[PDB]
Amino acid sequence: AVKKRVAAVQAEEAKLSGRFITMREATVVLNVLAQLHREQLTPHQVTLLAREQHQATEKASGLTATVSYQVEVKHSARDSVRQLHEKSTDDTGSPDWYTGASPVYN
Amino acid sequence: YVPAGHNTLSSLRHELRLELTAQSLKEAWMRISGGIYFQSADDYYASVDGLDAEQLGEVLAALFPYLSTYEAQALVQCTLDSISKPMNTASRQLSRTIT
């Protein structure tokens, strides 16, 4: 248990350092290959889908809605970089939320 | 003896685990692709019929951005090799020898 916990610490740190993966962090890559062999692709269609997944990476954002304007309903969406863009700022958008101990530059 | 940490009566309806293992990848894929299994990376590549290595390397350098360039390609190859048998190539082989 001791060693398994010390790795379970580094198994958190490397994850939050970004370049390390897990089951629901690579399960989408299992899905990538799944549908690439399901609905066949050509190379340039692959580059189009890759630019699609780079536009759904650093700007795609959650809380997507749809109409059934008479009736509308909204629920949350898959991850991105922009959900980090919004979780780094207390979800406030104003990066000066840390009113506590911090050095200042004037 | 039943090896260590290898669960016997593990199903697919049994919830998915978290450990990056060959067994874990293979069973998660069994859920995911339904029934596709490749005897190597290159069975998958003959199925994809013209998707080179870089053609997935760029896809994944995009998909997860904190990865570096060649590291995207590495995740590519590694998930292949882990749902397959590892590959016989002068790349891996010169890695082994030099190392």
Binding site: H37, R38, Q40 | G35, Y37
Partner: peptide, 25 residues
């Protein structure tokens, strides 16, 4: 049972190559 594993998975691979032409063309 060993042959049963092998059968199940080869017929799943047959199904996959069937779904190939049936879904993309």
């Amino acid at each position: 049972q060993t042959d049963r594993i092998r059968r199940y998975f080869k017929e799943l691979e047959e199904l996959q190559k069937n779904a190939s032409n049936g879904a993309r063309g």
